[PDB]
């Protein structure tokens, strides 16, 4: 009926309203009641777009009465906008200025639904030259904002927009169009925003959407992949220079507020750390900033952020990185509480993982002088973590993080393919074996089992062979003979095999793995 009713309206269009026997409105009101259920099919929307506005009855109330609810059911097609580009033809009929305003309002509001926005984009100048009209400007500007592309920014259009701005007043629509043209080829420079009066039509547009449903580089993750794939100079040098001048200016910003600036710099350091974790190499401006700002650094000022930048450091020789960084992450390590000792042994635990990731590929990409650097890092942390339990009297919370570091030191050969199985210092292994809680005892036992596995694996493909095996057997005979108050407490909570099964069922995973040896 909807198609037949609009052909009936067309029959009214071929004759005068006085000569007609029936009302022109009532049929269109039945059509409006239909639109309240279903507005217009693509062909139906096309037809009611093309004829009802050119020259015929199309009363400025009746035409608008439709145009309010004339929106498409499926979408708008190319043939819809074609013959109504002959409605913007703007002549003896002209679809007069009130219905013209409604027309461009419809073109903005239903601009989300076009099968080919490219065809309308190729109709750019036709709407652009209609922008000279004062009544159409606030809506033609929005339409062109949704219509714009680089091929439509010819310099004569730029100077026409500037002439419109000079002749007319400063307007948010023109301001939006000019800022967008500046976003494109900058023939103009200028420094509201999708603000529509279609909010009343948006409720209708909301029903239409429901009906359709029923029928410089840090804050860019999609471009961060590009710089992840180029270790070029003109890309990591512009990045070095922005990053250094942002870690300096925003760090000087600390020296004036230090209270609210510690939430944007902290949230900027967090984005830096996230970008480094994604890109998987320490930015050359973040060790250059750490080397500058570590001696000045206190314990808690951006602790979780400074000690995540330490983890992302390019692999350097320990004789050249220890004095610059590890001599200040020990000056601070030994003078700060357990919550900085654990936040550095966690920092250097991730640093070891990052230095081993880039060293496994140095085996994949075809050593000895880089080998001695990760070995020295482990020995230095093992020196940090053996005197940390001296300052803190073998604090179990600190020992948990210490063995978390060596949790990634045992599993070097199996995991990172590096022949760098490096054992505990005696003061750490024996103070974990003689600890009082089972949650660090079984961690040490698991690390011993992983040391067994890695030494056996290193015996296969092949100093790591003589002294490491001697000290490891030293640790083995000490622990396997001792394998205990924490276990005493577990036994109080409670036939040697039954006791072992009770321990094993109570989460004793590392102990079970090492006993299975």
């Amino acid at each position: 009926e909807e198609d037949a009713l609009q052909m009936a309206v067309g029959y009214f269009e071929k004759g005068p309203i006085k000569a007609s026997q029936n009302k022109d409105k009532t049929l269109e009101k039945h059509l409006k009641t239909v639109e309240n259920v279903a507005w217009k099919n693509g062909l139906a929307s096309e037809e009611i777009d093309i004829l009802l506005n050119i020259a015929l009855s199309g009363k400025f109330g009746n035409a608008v009465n439709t145009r309010i609810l004339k929106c498409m059911i499926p979408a708008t097609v190319i043939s819809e906008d074609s013959v109504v580009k002959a409605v913007s033809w703007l002549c003896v009929g002209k679809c007069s200025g009130s219905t013209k305003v409604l027309f461009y309002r419809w073109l903005v509001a239903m601009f989300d639904f076009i099968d080919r926005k490219e065809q309308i984009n190729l109709l750019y100048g036709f709407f652009f030259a209609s922008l000279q009209d004062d009544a159409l400007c606030p809506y033609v500007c929005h339409l062109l904002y949704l219509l714009t592309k680089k091929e439509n920014v010819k310099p004569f259009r730029v100077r026409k927009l500037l002439d419109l701005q000079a002749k007319m007043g400063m307007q948010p629509h023109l301001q939006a169009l000019l800022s967008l043209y500046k976003f494109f080829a900058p023939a103009l420079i200028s420094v509201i925003y999708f603000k529509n009066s279609e909010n009343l039509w948006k409720t209708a547009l909301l029903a239409v959407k429901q009906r359709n449903r029923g029928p410089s580089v840090l804050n860019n993750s999609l471009l961060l992949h590009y710089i992840n794939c180029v270790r070029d100079e003109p890309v990591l040098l512009r990045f070095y220079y922005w990053l250094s001048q942002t870690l300096q200016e925003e760090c000087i910003w600390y020296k004036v507020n230090n209270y609210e600036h510690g939430k944007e710099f902290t949230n900027f350091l967090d984005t830096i750390i996230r970008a480094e974790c994604f890109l998987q190499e320490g930015f050359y401006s973040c060790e250059a900033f750490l080397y500058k700002s570590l001696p000045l650094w206190d314990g808690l000022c951006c602790r979780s952020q400074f000690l995540q930048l330490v983890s992302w450091i390019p692999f350097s020789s320990f004789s050249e990185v220890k004095p610059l960084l590890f001599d200040h992450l020990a000056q601070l390590f030994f003078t700060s509480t357990i919550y900085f000792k654990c936040s550095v042994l966690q920092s250097l635990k991730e640093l070891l993982q990052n230095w081993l990731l880039w060293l496994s590929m140095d085996i994949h990409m075809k050593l000895g002088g880089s080998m001695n650097s990760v070995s020295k890092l482990i020995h230095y942390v093992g020196w940090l973590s053996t005197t940390a339990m001296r300052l803190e009297s073998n604090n179990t919370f600190l020992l948990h993080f210490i063995l978390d570091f060596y949790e990634k030191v045992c599993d070097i050969y199996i995991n990172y393919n590096l022949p760098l199985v490096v054992l505990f210092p005696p003061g750490i292994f024996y103070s974990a074996l003689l600890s009082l809680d089972t949650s660090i005892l079984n961690q040490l036992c698991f690390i011993m089992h992983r040391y067994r596995k890695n030494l056996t694996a290193a015996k296969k493909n092949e100093n790591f062979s003589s002294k490491t095996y001697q000290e490891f057997n030293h640790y083995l005979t000490s622990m396997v003979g001792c394998l205990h108050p924490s276990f005493l407490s577990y036994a109080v909570s409670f036939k040697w095999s039954w006791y072992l099964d009770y321990l094993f069922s109570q989460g004793l995973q590392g102990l079970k793995l090492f006993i299975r040896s």
Binding site: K154, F156, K160, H225, N228, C342, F397
Partner: protein
């Protein structure tokens, strides 16, 4: 309380690293197929063949120009001169020739004022900002 936080930041970082690895595999296959395609696709470009493509563009653009100008001869018969005052086509082409090598005069106020105010409203030509007895064709370049 800190090994639960480590496990939380481990699961969150595991999801984030899985997403990053998926996006890395995508730009791995895409980069490899782009290298394979561009290998012996744009590398097989001769300077002589490159100039031949520019000659094809010469003929295509010349035929597009002869299409636009043929339509400027056909459709502008709907316009048509009626009754010297110059024909609209001729005064428009005398605008175009003047801007073609430049001028800010272009018509020196060509006659039939409905015709000069025809090609002034739509953006075809412009008045001179100081002496408005002289015309310029909007500098479409």
């Amino acid at each position: 309380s800190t090994k639960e936080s480590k496990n939380e930041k481990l699961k969150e970082d595991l999801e984030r690293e899985q997403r990053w690895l998926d996006e890395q595999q995508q730009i791995m296959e895409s980069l490899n197929v782009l290298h394979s395609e561009l290998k012996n696709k744009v590398e097989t470009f001769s300077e002589s063949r490159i100039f031949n493509e520019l000659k094809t563009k010469m003929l295509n653009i010349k035929e597009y120009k002869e299409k636009l100008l043929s339509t400027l001869g056909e459709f502008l018969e709907d316009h048509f001169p009626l009754p010297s005052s110059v024909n609209l086509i001729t005064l428009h082409e005398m605008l175009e020739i003047l801007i073609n090598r430049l001028p800010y005069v272009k018509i020196s106020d060509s006659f039939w004022p409905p015709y000069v105010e025809l090609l002034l409203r739509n953006g075809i030509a412009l008045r001179h900002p100081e002496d408005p007895t002289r015309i310029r064709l909007e500098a479409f370049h």
